[PDB]
Amino acid sequence: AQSVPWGISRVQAPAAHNRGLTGSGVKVAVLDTGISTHPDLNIRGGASFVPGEPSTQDGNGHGTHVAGTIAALNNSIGVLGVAPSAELYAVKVLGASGSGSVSSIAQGLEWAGNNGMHVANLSLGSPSPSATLEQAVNSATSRGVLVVAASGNSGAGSISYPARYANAMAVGATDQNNNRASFSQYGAGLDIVAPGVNVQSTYPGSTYASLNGTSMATPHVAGAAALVKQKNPSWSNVQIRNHLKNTATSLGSTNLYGSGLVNAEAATR
Numbered sequence: 224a225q226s227v228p229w230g231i232s233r234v235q236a237p238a239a240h241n242r243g244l245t246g247s248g249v250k251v252a253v254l255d256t257g258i259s260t261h262p263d264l265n266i267r268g269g270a271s272f273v274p275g276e277p278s279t280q281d282g283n284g285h286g287t288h289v290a291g292t293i294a295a296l297n298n299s300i301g302v303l304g305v306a307p308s309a310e311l312y313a314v315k316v317l318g319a320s321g322s323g324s325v326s327s328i329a330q331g332l333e334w335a336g337n338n339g340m341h342v343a344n345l346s347l348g349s350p351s352p353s354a355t356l357e358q359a360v361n362s363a364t365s366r367g368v369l370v371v372a373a374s375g376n377s378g379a380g381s382i383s384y385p386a387r388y389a390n391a392m393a394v395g396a397t398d399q400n401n402n403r404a405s406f407s408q409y410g411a412g413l414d415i416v417a418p419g420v421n422v423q424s425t426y427p428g429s430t431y432a433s434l435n436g437t438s439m440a441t442p443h444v445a446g447a448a449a450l451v452k453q454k455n456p457s458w459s460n461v462q463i464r465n466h467l468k469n470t471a472t473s474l475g476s477t478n479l480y481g482s483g484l485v486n487a488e489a490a491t492r
């Protein structure tokens with residue numbers, strides 16, 4: 224039987240699914256540790272920019288988990304993604320150890336802007352600014368890709384890079400009570416928040432795992448952008464970003480929660 228992770232229900236993805244919006248035709252690049260084939264995922268392609276890791280198979284589990292939150296298939300097993308029909312591209316920019324260089328991440332961005340991706344999910348970040356990454360974020364943006372990035376897990380009142388760059392949409396993590404997770408970075412530049420605690424998703428070995436992190440929050444917004452894009456095919460990245468924010472459920476202070484909790488039902492009405 225298929226289970227609906229709590230976060231999926233929380234962002235109200237099933238209401239959009241019920242209206243016929245599943246992310247069909249939207250190409251979503253997952254810039255991460257790769258994505259492993261799995262019974263509950265459909266991977267359309269990708270490339271690897273990690274030296275020594277030429278395949279787009281995930282040696283860590285992180286990218287596979289993230290990819291399941293965005294598009295785990297709607298069928299009778301496993302879990303269910305926010306946009307179960309989005310077309311997932313594995314753009315491996317992080318090694319199996321979970322970290323990667325600015326160069327790898329910048330090359331994955333350029334790939335996503337070059338190969339017509341609509342949304343790029345960056346469930347990664349560092350405290351360190353990088354002009355090279357800013358330039359790649361900007362370039363992908365100018366090519367129509369909506370870059371969505373994790374705010375970071377330091378707990379601090381400022382946001383990690385690249386989420387701190389203007390053109391990256393910054394996503395914080397909430398818990399089951401709709402409270403900012405204690406690890407969730409916040410502050411200037413935070414756009415919105417989404418479920419980031421006890422998030423069950425796909426894991427290599429045709430299994431499922433529950434993880435915590437702004438890394439898990441990010442993909443619920445990347446999947447919600449694919450629903451909006453399906454609904455409004457002519458909107459650009461900026462229009463989508465702004466609509467997800469204008470329709471989020473406000474939770475209080477924008478400094479702590481950005482615009483609030485992403486809401487896929489509100490955003491696709």
Ligand SMILES: [Ca+2]
Binds near residue numbers: 225
């Ligand atoms: Ca499933």
Ligand SMILES: [Ca+2]
Binds near residue numbers: 385388389390393412
């Ligand atoms: Ca930003």
